[PDB]
């Protein structure tokens, strides 16, 4: 089974709300909302992974970032760990730079459901903030 180190980045203004954007019906996690990343490359940790994947989607370079959740979940057809990276500072205003949809959610109004499962537990934690 694969195993994957994949690092995220949420990214949340001074209003309280998300960017997020919706993955693509061909992907692992087809259609889901998701936290802009992806897959931590050999030679670059995971802080330089989550600056470079949000560079990539969404156009912006996140600056003095937190670590906020680590947690492995296993999918049907692949082991992943997750680095959820609380991003409140960052330089560019995020677009969907991927021709991917993306737009400013309300951390309130966030439904898990609506995610992989994975995110369910850091969903929860951001609304208790
Ligand atoms: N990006 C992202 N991926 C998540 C989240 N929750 C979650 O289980 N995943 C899973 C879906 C995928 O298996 C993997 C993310 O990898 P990815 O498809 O974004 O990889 P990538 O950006 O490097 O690849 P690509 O779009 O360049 O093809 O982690 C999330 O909030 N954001
Ligand atoms: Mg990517
Ligand atoms: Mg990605
Ligand atoms: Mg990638």
């Known amino acids: 089974?694969?195993?994957?180190?994949?690092?995220?980045?949420?990214?949340r203004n001074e209003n309280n709300e998300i960017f997020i954007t919706r993955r693509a019906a061909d992907a692992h996690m087809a259609?889901?909302?998701?936290?802009?990343?992806?897959?931590?490359?050999?030679?670059?940790?995971?802080?330089?992974?989550?600056?470079?994947?949000?560079?990539?989607?969404?156009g912006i370079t996140p600056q003095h970032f937190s670590l906020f959740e680590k947690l492995e979940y296993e999918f049907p057809d692949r082991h992943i760990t997750l680095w959820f990276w609380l991003v409140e500072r960052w330089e560019g205003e995020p677009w969907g730079k991927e021709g991917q949809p993306g737009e400013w959610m309300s951390l309130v109004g966030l439904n898990a459901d609506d995610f992989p499962p994975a995110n369910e537990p850091?969903?929860?934690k951001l609304k208790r903030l």
């Open 1 to 11: 089974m694969k195993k994957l180190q994949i690092a995220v980045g949420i990214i």
């Open 31 to 58: 259609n889901k909302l998701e936290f802009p990343g992806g897959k931590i490359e050999m030679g670059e940790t995971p802080e330089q992974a989550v600056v470079r994947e949000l560079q990539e989607e969404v």
């Open 122 to 124: 850091v969903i929860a």
